């Protein structure tokens, strides 16, 4: 797999994760899930967060969730796709690059005489 591929698949798992966090907080009422349905979705999501989301962008995890709770899976899918437009990709690459250059500089300066 290319470095780009590796990075892509890892991002996809991050987004699935972010989506789970977002939906978990949504489901948590003010002081607890209020409806019978939100309660079930809340409990299923909590159970599924105790299981790893493999190195496959979280899709195997999503499929399992969809079997158990199709409504919950649709919302999780909607949120992770929406997040593609919120995630600050430019900032991300910018930080990764600048901090690589800054760490190199600090390490080299330290070792120099």
């Amino acid at each position: 797999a290319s470095p780009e591929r590796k990075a892509a698949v890892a991002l996809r798992s991050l987004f699935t994760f972010v989506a789970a966090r977002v939906v978990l907080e949504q489901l948590q009422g003010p002081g607890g899930p209020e409806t019978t349905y939100n309660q079930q979705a809340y409990l299923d999501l909590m159970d599924f967060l105790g299981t790893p989301m493999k190195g496959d962008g979280g899709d195997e995890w999503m499929a399992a969730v969809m079997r158990k709770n199709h409504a919950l899976a649709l919302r999780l899918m909607e949120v992770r796709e929406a997040y593609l437009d919120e995630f600050e990709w430019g900032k991300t690459m910018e930080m990764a690059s600048r901090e690589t250059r800054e760490a190199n500089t600090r390490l080299m300066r330290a070792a120099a005489m």
Partner: peptide, 6 residues
């Protein structure tokens, strides 16, 4: 009951 981490 969980600290959910990535």
């Amino acid at each position: 009951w969980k600290e959910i981490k990535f």
